[PDB]
Amino acid sequence: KKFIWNSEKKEFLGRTGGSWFKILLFYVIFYGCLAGIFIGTIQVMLLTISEFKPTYQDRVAPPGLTQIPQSQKTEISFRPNDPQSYESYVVSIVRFLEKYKDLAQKDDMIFEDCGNVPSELKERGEYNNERGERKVCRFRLEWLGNCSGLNDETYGYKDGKPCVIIKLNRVLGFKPKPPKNESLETYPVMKYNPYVLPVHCTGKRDEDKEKVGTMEYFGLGGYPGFPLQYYPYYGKLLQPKYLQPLMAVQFTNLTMDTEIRIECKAYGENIGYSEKDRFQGRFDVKIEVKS
Amino acid sequence: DPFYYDYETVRNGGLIFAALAFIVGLIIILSK
Amino acid sequence: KERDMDELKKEVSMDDHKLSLDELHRKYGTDLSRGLTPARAAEILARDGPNALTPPPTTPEWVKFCRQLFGGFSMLLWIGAILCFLAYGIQAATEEEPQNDNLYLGVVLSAVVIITGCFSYYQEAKSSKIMESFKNMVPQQALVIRNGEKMSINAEEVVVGDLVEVKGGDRIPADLRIISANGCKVDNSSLTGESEPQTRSPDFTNENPLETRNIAFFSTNCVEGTARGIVVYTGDRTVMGRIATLASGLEGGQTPIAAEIEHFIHIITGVAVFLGVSFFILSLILEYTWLEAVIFLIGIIVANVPEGLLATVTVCLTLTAKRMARKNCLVKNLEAVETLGSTSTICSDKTGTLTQNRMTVAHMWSDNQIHEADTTENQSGVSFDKTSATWLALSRIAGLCNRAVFQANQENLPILKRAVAGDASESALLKCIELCCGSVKEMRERYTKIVEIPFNSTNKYQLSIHKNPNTAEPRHLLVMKGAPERILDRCSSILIHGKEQPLDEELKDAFQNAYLELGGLGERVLGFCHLFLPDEQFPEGFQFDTDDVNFPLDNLCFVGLISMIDPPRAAVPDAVGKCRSAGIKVIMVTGDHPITAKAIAKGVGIISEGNETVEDIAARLNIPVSQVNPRDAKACVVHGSDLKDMTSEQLDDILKYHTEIVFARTSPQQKLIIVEGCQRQGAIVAVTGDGVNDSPASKKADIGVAMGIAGSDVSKQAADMILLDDNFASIVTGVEEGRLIFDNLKKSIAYTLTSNIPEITPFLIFIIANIPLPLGTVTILCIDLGTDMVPAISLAYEQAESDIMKRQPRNPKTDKLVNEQLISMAYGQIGMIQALGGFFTYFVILAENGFLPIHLLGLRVNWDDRWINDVEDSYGQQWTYEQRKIVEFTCHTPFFVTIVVVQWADLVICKTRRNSVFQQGMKNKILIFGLFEETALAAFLSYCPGMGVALRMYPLKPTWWFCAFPYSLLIFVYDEVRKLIIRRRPGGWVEKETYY
Ligand SMILES: *[C@@H]1O[C@H](CO)[C@@H](O[C@@H]2O[C@H](CO)[C@@H](O)[C@H](O)[C@H]2NC(C)=O)[C@H](O)[C@H]1NC(C)=O
Ligand SMILES: *[C@@H]1O[C@H](CO)[C@@H](O[C@@H]2O[C@H](CO)[C@@H](O)[C@H](O)[C@H]2NC(C)=O)[C@H](O)[C@H]1NC(C)=O
Ligand SMILES: CC(C)CCC[C@@H](C)[C@H]1CC[C@H]2[C@@H]3CC=C4C[C@@H](O)CC[C@]4(C)[C@H]3CC[C@]12C
Ligand SMILES: CC(C)CCC[C@@H](C)[C@H]1CC[C@H]2[C@@H]3CC=C4C[C@@H](O)CC[C@]4(C)[C@H]3CC[C@]12C
Ligand SMILES: CC(C)CCC[C@@H](C)[C@H]1CC[C@H]2[C@@H]3CC=C4C[C@@H](O)CC[C@]4(C)[C@H]3CC[C@]12C
Ligand SMILES: C[C@]12CC[C@H](O)C[C@H]1CC[C@@H]1[C@@H]2CC[C@]2(C)[C@@H](c3ccc(=O)oc3)CC[C@]12O
Ligand SMILES: *[C@@H]1O[C@H](CO)[C@@H](O)[C@H](O)[C@H]1NC(C)=O
Ligand SMILES: [Mg+2]
Ligand SMILES: [Mg+2]
Ligand code: NA
């Protein structure tokens, strides 16, 4: 009963030729109309959103805190001797900082020298297109001391005592608000509380806090945070080639051949946290310099 | 700030709607 | 080697009844007047087994529970669960932090099968439980003569070859060989279907042991008289024992609904594996490894398995079976509720099924006029004229001259269903007089009987003389009844409207034609006459001792004939008409005499009035029957004697060229042969019976119907449906519901099958376009086993769109439950629109939160990564892992809501297959509640506190609820114009391509 393939009375795969053509033509017209309808409605949907601002921004309320070595499990395990053991790290650090070189920020029509000292926020009018393409404040690699260097094509980084820079999640129109001068026990930090978003790293328990001996932070002018002169963001369309602030963190006194956990928590009023997302506001890393 | 959404009001309205729709359906199947 | 055992049981029985009394006593070794010694009786009792059939094969409860856990649909869900655990096993050992989805789905599918098994098992067990409450087996002790003494022992203690005596009322214990009878009449209705009580004489009469009178049978009841006999057969070796053993050892077959579900699964898995394999090859062609492609194949195949359609179909069948049990039409098998609708040839039994199996006064004769009495089982018919003097005289002749009286408890029972002691004919007369002529108690004692004369062996006449209580004449009233040929010879006067007239042939010949009219009608007629004895020649003191001629045999006054026959049940003729109207062939299959079978066939509708048999044409033309062409005869009567000498081709021709067929004098084995002959044509068969002879026919038929009270236990167990109220019209209700639920099942299946396209398309394009997952697994479960359950169940409550009892029975090779048109509608057109609506809501949610749809291409690579917490959207923003995952889950929730929104329109359009939603109407309250509960449940799953934590379903911004509205309206309007073109244009495009 499964050899209905053909017959002398015209049937193919179950039906005739003229029936195959009728059904195929119907399905082509039907699916064509469906495609045109879906495209028209998706076009109306495109007309309901603007080009300079996302309609809903509540799902990114607490900005994240990422790092340069995008490790497979936020773990930095390598050998201080073997150059190939830490190649995956250095490669990502060089590729990340490839857009921060002095040659990359050379056009004066799209770059603006903010300053050597963190200042107040820089609001460049409204988010509409009435104004031209906004300017992006420059950020030279020299600000991250001891983790930038004047190396060649390959940034000879730190083998012993590694470097891990942190970055604040770029959010459109987000204005960072550092904590008030009434700091509720925020782990010794400089007195530059008004024009920089503080970020302090620490261990996770009584063991990690003891294994991690000394940490050295590097930022704009020597402050462990992000300067407010680089915010807010005006979208990729209005501010292409934008360079968000960076801040490096070096762990000098580490216990070699021991995996220790570090939590770099960014503080501020507009910086939230989450017990489900260990990256919202805070940031975790598992460093282990095994020799 | 635009980074805030009154999810409690929408959630409350959704729960009230579900309650009203279910009790109305129960009245529908109880024709008396 | 059971094949030979069953073959030796499909053959009609043999015997040695044709033996002289000396040869019988020599073969069995038994005294003809003393039986045998009790020691010999105990030696045989402990040699071959007690006189009782071996109990039925006990069916343990764990066996049928495992049965409910298996099947065809539950097996597909089982293979789905197995495939889920196989995929999860591959994902566990092969990749890092494996996902629990597949395991969750496998245990859910297993739970679905187990729960469906528990429910269906509880239903079938409930049916069998209420069935056990009908076995009222009262032990019946037999009267056995052993060692020269009479003793009453249990029926099981009876052995082979021993004297047994039976009295009018007692039941024939085993199969007896009559040796001496005294006006003994037995009842062969439950065994051979012979309606009128067949008498039993010691002399051998027919070569067939069933037709001869020297044999009493197992389970038969001696109506009147007393007789003796030697037990020839005992236990299972008996006639009804071999019939019951044959019934138990027969095949049930495959119900039509089961074959339809199997074909449905064939198409489901066909397209499922086609898509899975083609996408397995496509995934390998793109970039994915065998490890990943295997998981894709399993996911696509398992995804195309309706997880909830099992429970919905089961509840559909259960609901219709509930309505069946409400009308006292219980079904033992659940799916058997549908077989009646697919039936196209009904083989019915005459005695006890088509008829009432009870002698009843059919017609009366008075004033040379035929008067038909009401013969309904509940007395709901036309009442004859009961105000003439001829009736007032005939009623007294019958109520007085009759050896029939009611028993002790016959008080609260109705006039018909009550028990009467005596002859069946006298019982019918007593009931007719007690019903249409007041009461016979005070009417019988009013005329004190002086001298009587019972029925004679030759010239059968029954007469009696009574005193006259009239206040105008003291003459003695003599009455007599008998065969019309015996009364015509002893009559000279004729009563008319109160006065007398001579025996003029002008009205005597009219009496002869009336006699042949009621006789040719298959009825048994009797004549009643009376006369006023002159008180001058026979005073009030004279005693007419029954010795000589004290009464004038001739010169009597004939009042009128009184016929009688077993009448059909009340709604039987109308039911036969309804069955024929629906295109169901009605074929009578009974072992009764042909002269009565043809009359009952014409009276109920099996033989349409006007149609002639092969013999009727030869009788109308006065030519030999061998001359008329059988093609000129639509109806035909087939005698059992001739049926024994038939081949397969001959029976095929009998059924192919004759539209109204009646099989008479057919043995139970021949009944089975007839059912098989009907099944050879390829049509669904339903056998409706009551006696043990209906057991092998009800078992082999596609569906058996047994009478709940007037039926035997063997055929009632071997059947698939029981009529607890014996209302034969329930057959019509059954054939209606069987078609109703069939169409509703089509609608329900198209509903569950429409939701598969939007359930699989997100994963399909997830593999192709490399976009984030649009629809989640738990959300899919909330659709298939959550919301959609109530709408799909409500789809069973839909009513008929046109008259279903008007269309012809569905062709099994053409009208399948799930044809290629339902796939073109659900999978092809409606489900496609639902998938597009889901993708629209998806792109709306992502584009509004910063991820433009064009930007979503190739994004899943880094999207699903658990450590890339800086994923650029279309606005340059950096999204963490949990943030964008929260968006994906709060993106799965509206996809599920979109499914419910499009299911609103899909349910409204599936509710009607041809009619318009405005024509039919939203009168289905269960469907309204289905939409209300569906929407309220979908809203609750999204807005309940703690859902984004447990089920990962996050709340929806109100505008999301409207992203799916245009697609639902589109679906509704499209299907509406579809059904409109089907209505206006019933020819072929919209009908043969989309109408399923
Ligand atoms: C950056 O690294 C240099 C080493 O290359 C550090 O220079 C040393 O600083 C200490 C004081 O902390 C002096 O005692 C050493 O003599 C210096 N050595 C050299 C070679 O210059 C420098 O301190 C580091 N910078 C920071 C901010 O930690
Ligand atoms: C850097 O860490 C080392 C430990 O690795 C510190 O030196 C140790 O001090 C303890 C006493 O507290 C001694 O028992 C160990 O023998 C020392 N080890 C070494 C290698 O010197 C050291 O003080 C830390 N230095 C700074 C600047 O934090
Ligand atoms: C086609 C028509 C007749 C169906 C009638 C039901 C429609 C109008 C109902 C069904 C579900 C409803 C939604 C239920 C849930 C939400 C969230 C709540 O916090 C605001 C209302 C809102 C956004 C409702 C809008 C109206 C809505 C879409
Ligand atoms: C992921 C993408 C590329 C898969 C595209 C699949 C499309 C092209 C397939 C899926 C289901 C298919 C249809 C399935 C049902 C019908 C009815 C049948 O009697 C003829 C084929 C016809 C008319 C098919 C036409 C092509 C079709 C719409
Ligand atoms: C021929 C006619 C009836 C078709 C008209 C199409 C209508 C019904 C369709 C076209 C585009 C659709 C809209 C597209 C854009 C938006 C914004 C979104 O955030 C919610 C859905 C919503 C609000 C849709 C509602 C229904 C809509 C207006
Ligand atoms: C676990 C899963 C693996 C592939 C990819 O990593 C995405 C993962 C999450 C979703 C999960 C798939 C697996 C198949 C599904 C259960 C399969 C499915 C869904 C519903 C259903 O009834 O049967 C199968 C399609 C997608 C699926 O739900
Ligand atoms: C915060 O307080 C300290 C002294 O407690 C003071 O030196 C510093 O200037 C204050 N900063 C601001 C911004 O008020
Ligand atoms: Mg499904
Ligand atoms: Mg019967
Ligand atoms: Na059966």
PDB file of C-alpha atoms in Angstrom, chain A residues 1 15 19 22-23 26-27 30-31 34-35 37-39 41-43 45-46 48-67 70-74 96 167-172 233-237 244 276-280 286, chain C residues 96 263 820 823-825 827-830 832-833 836-837 839-840 843-844 847-850 852-855 865-870 872-884 886-887 890 949 952 954-955 957 959-960 966-967 970 974 989 992-994:
ATOM      1  CA  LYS A   1       0.000   0.000   0.000  1.00  0.00           C
ATOM      2  CA  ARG A  15      -1.170  13.039  -6.096  1.00  0.00           C
ATOM      3  CA  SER A  19      -2.757  18.804  -8.311  1.00  0.00           C
ATOM      4  CA  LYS A  22      -2.302  23.754  -7.846  1.00  0.00           C
ATOM      5  CA  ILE A  23      -1.194  23.076  -4.254  1.00  0.00           C
ATOM      6  CA  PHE A  26      -1.551  28.073  -3.508  1.00  0.00           C
ATOM      7  CA  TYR A  27       1.121  27.578  -0.850  1.00  0.00           C
ATOM      8  CA  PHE A  30      -0.315  32.041   0.812  1.00  0.00           C
ATOM      9  CA  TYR A  31       3.177  32.036   2.322  1.00  0.00           C
ATOM     10  CA  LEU A  34       2.146  35.766   5.230  1.00  0.00           C
ATOM     11  CA  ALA A  35       5.684  37.042   4.643  1.00  0.00           C
ATOM     12  CA  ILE A  37       2.130  40.723   6.463  1.00  0.00           C
ATOM     13  CA  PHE A  38       4.868  39.831   8.949  1.00  0.00           C
ATOM     14  CA  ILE A  39       7.210  42.276   7.213  1.00  0.00           C
ATOM     15  CA  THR A  41       3.925  44.614  10.985  1.00  0.00           C
ATOM     16  CA  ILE A  42       7.648  44.357  11.752  1.00  0.00           C
ATOM     17  CA  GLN A  43       8.057  47.628   9.825  1.00  0.00           C
ATOM     18  CA  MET A  45       7.340  47.958  14.956  1.00  0.00           C
ATOM     19  CA  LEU A  46      10.510  49.548  13.569  1.00  0.00           C
ATOM     20  CA  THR A  48       7.602  52.711  16.940  1.00  0.00           C
ATOM     21  CA  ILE A  49      11.253  52.887  18.114  1.00  0.00           C
ATOM     22  CA  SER A  50      13.729  55.740  17.735  1.00  0.00           C
ATOM     23  CA  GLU A  51      17.346  55.750  16.575  1.00  0.00           C
ATOM     24  CA  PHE A  52      18.807  57.682  19.526  1.00  0.00           C
ATOM     25  CA  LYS A  53      17.270  55.908  22.534  1.00  0.00           C
ATOM     26  CA  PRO A  54      15.880  52.483  23.499  1.00  0.00           C
ATOM     27  CA  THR A  55      12.251  52.570  24.613  1.00  0.00           C
ATOM     28  CA  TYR A  56      12.764  50.332  27.666  1.00  0.00           C
ATOM     29  CA  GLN A  57      15.910  50.724  29.791  1.00  0.00           C
ATOM     30  CA  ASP A  58      14.772  49.183  33.091  1.00  0.00           C
ATOM     31  CA  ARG A  59      16.326  45.756  32.412  1.00  0.00           C
ATOM     32  CA  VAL A  60      19.834  47.271  32.702  1.00  0.00           C
ATOM     33  CA  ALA A  61      19.170  49.300  35.886  1.00  0.00           C
ATOM     34  CA  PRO A  62      22.278  48.098  37.789  1.00  0.00           C
ATOM     35  CA  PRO A  63      25.256  48.373  35.422  1.00  0.00           C
ATOM     36  CA  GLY A  64      27.665  45.461  35.284  1.00  0.00           C
ATOM     37  CA  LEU A  65      31.376  45.351  36.101  1.00  0.00           C
ATOM     38  CA  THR A  66      33.460  43.398  33.584  1.00  0.00           C
ATOM     39  CA  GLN A  67      37.204  42.743  33.187  1.00  0.00           C
ATOM     40  CA  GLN A  70      37.301  37.276  29.632  1.00  0.00           C
ATOM     41  CA  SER A  71      38.181  33.946  31.221  1.00  0.00           C
ATOM     42  CA  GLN A  72      36.157  30.785  30.653  1.00  0.00           C
ATOM     43  CA  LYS A  73      35.174  30.699  34.361  1.00  0.00           C
ATOM     44  CA  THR A  74      36.462  34.116  35.584  1.00  0.00           C
ATOM     45  CA  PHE A  96      40.848  45.310  24.067  1.00  0.00           C
ATOM     46  CA  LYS A 167      35.220  48.365  33.158  1.00  0.00           C
ATOM     47  CA  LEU A 168      31.784  49.826  33.865  1.00  0.00           C
ATOM     48  CA  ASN A 169      28.985  48.614  31.602  1.00  0.00           C
ATOM     49  CA  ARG A 170      28.266  51.281  28.995  1.00  0.00           C
ATOM     50  CA  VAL A 171      24.649  52.429  29.445  1.00  0.00           C
ATOM     51  CA  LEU A 172      22.875  55.103  27.405  1.00  0.00           C
ATOM     52  CA  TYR A 233      26.651  57.798  26.940  1.00  0.00           C
ATOM     53  CA  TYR A 234      24.715  59.016  23.884  1.00  0.00           C
ATOM     54  CA  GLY A 235      24.361  55.745  21.967  1.00  0.00           C
ATOM     55  CA  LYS A 236      26.530  54.193  19.258  1.00  0.00           C
ATOM     56  CA  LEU A 237      24.825  56.169  16.477  1.00  0.00           C
ATOM     57  CA  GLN A 244      34.467  54.249  28.322  1.00  0.00           C
ATOM     58  CA  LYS A 276      21.503  36.163  41.306  1.00  0.00           C
ATOM     59  CA  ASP A 277      23.809  38.144  38.981  1.00  0.00           C
ATOM     60  CA  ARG A 278      27.285  38.285  40.515  1.00  0.00           C
ATOM     61  CA  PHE A 279      28.219  40.843  37.824  1.00  0.00           C
ATOM     62  CA  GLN A 280      25.593  43.537  38.539  1.00  0.00           C
ATOM     63  CA  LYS A 286      39.574  33.412  40.777  1.00  0.00           C
TER      64      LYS A 286
ATOM     65  CA  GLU C  96      29.979  21.354  30.838  1.00  0.00           C
ATOM     66  CA  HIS C 263      -2.837   5.964  11.430  1.00  0.00           C
ATOM     67  CA  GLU C 820      -3.914  14.820   4.919  1.00  0.00           C
ATOM     68  CA  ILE C 823      -2.126  18.392   8.430  1.00  0.00           C
ATOM     69  CA  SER C 824      -2.381  21.018   5.678  1.00  0.00           C
ATOM     70  CA  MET C 825      -4.539  23.155   7.997  1.00  0.00           C
ATOM     71  CA  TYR C 827       0.706  22.313  10.442  1.00  0.00           C
ATOM     72  CA  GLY C 828       0.373  24.187   7.143  1.00  0.00           C
ATOM     73  CA  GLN C 829      -1.781  27.307   7.502  1.00  0.00           C
ATOM     74  CA  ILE C 830      -3.029  28.093  11.034  1.00  0.00           C
ATOM     75  CA  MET C 832       2.194  28.914  10.564  1.00  0.00           C
ATOM     76  CA  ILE C 833       0.377  32.177  11.324  1.00  0.00           C
ATOM     77  CA  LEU C 836       4.714  34.281  12.857  1.00  0.00           C
ATOM     78  CA  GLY C 837       2.720  36.019  15.597  1.00  0.00           C
ATOM     79  CA  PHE C 839       8.127  35.750  16.324  1.00  0.00           C
ATOM     80  CA  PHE C 840       6.527  39.185  16.033  1.00  0.00           C
ATOM     81  CA  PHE C 843      11.130  40.893  17.895  1.00  0.00           C
ATOM     82  CA  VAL C 844       8.964  43.539  19.570  1.00  0.00           C
ATOM     83  CA  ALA C 847      13.861  45.615  19.667  1.00  0.00           C
ATOM     84  CA  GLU C 848      12.202  47.664  22.400  1.00  0.00           C
ATOM     85  CA  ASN C 849      14.805  46.644  25.014  1.00  0.00           C
ATOM     86  CA  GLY C 850      17.725  47.652  22.759  1.00  0.00           C
ATOM     87  CA  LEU C 852      17.054  45.462  17.007  1.00  0.00           C
ATOM     88  CA  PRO C 853      15.837  42.383  15.072  1.00  0.00           C
ATOM     89  CA  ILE C 854      18.444  42.749  12.312  1.00  0.00           C
ATOM     90  CA  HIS C 855      21.120  42.780  15.050  1.00  0.00           C
ATOM     91  CA  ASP C 865      27.699  32.353  26.977  1.00  0.00           C
ATOM     92  CA  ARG C 866      27.573  32.507  30.789  1.00  0.00           C
ATOM     93  CA  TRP C 867      30.699  34.662  31.151  1.00  0.00           C
ATOM     94  CA  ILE C 868      30.503  37.272  28.373  1.00  0.00           C
ATOM     95  CA  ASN C 869      28.876  39.963  30.513  1.00  0.00           C
ATOM     96  CA  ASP C 870      29.470  42.740  27.924  1.00  0.00           C
ATOM     97  CA  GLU C 872      26.671  44.891  22.687  1.00  0.00           C
ATOM     98  CA  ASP C 873      23.084  45.571  21.601  1.00  0.00           C
ATOM     99  CA  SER C 874      22.116  47.900  18.756  1.00  0.00           C
ATOM    100  CA  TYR C 875      22.550  51.032  20.927  1.00  0.00           C
ATOM    101  CA  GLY C 876      26.078  50.236  22.144  1.00  0.00           C
ATOM    102  CA  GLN C 877      24.962  49.150  25.628  1.00  0.00           C
ATOM    103  CA  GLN C 878      26.725  46.313  27.467  1.00  0.00           C
ATOM    104  CA  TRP C 879      24.480  43.531  28.802  1.00  0.00           C
ATOM    105  CA  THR C 880      25.535  41.092  31.520  1.00  0.00           C
ATOM    106  CA  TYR C 881      24.627  37.400  31.428  1.00  0.00           C
ATOM    107  CA  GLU C 882      21.675  37.395  33.826  1.00  0.00           C
ATOM    108  CA  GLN C 883      20.333  40.723  32.499  1.00  0.00           C
ATOM    109  CA  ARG C 884      19.967  39.499  28.926  1.00  0.00           C
ATOM    110  CA  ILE C 886      16.098  37.856  32.156  1.00  0.00           C
ATOM    111  CA  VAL C 887      15.122  39.460  28.861  1.00  0.00           C
ATOM    112  CA  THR C 890      10.617  37.647  29.886  1.00  0.00           C
ATOM    113  CA  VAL C 949      12.314  32.249  40.029  1.00  0.00           C
ATOM    114  CA  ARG C 952      11.545  31.534  34.976  1.00  0.00           C
ATOM    115  CA  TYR C 954       8.704  37.078  34.258  1.00  0.00           C
ATOM    116  CA  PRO C 955       5.916  39.697  34.198  1.00  0.00           C
ATOM    117  CA  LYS C 957       4.553  44.943  30.057  1.00  0.00           C
ATOM    118  CA  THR C 959       1.604  46.372  25.465  1.00  0.00           C
ATOM    119  CA  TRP C 960       2.975  42.848  24.913  1.00  0.00           C
ATOM    120  CA  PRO C 966      -3.766  41.089  14.721  1.00  0.00           C
ATOM    121  CA  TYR C 967      -2.547  37.543  14.069  1.00  0.00           C
ATOM    122  CA  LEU C 970      -6.200  37.198  10.787  1.00  0.00           C
ATOM    123  CA  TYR C 974      -8.992  33.456   7.086  1.00  0.00           C
ATOM    124  CA  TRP C 989     -11.055  23.249  -4.111  1.00  0.00           C
ATOM    125  CA  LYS C 992     -11.017  18.600  -0.927  1.00  0.00           C
ATOM    126  CA  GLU C 993      -7.913  20.573   0.130  1.00  0.00           C
ATOM    127  CA  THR C 994      -8.611  22.174   3.528  1.00  0.00           C
TER     128      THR C 994
END
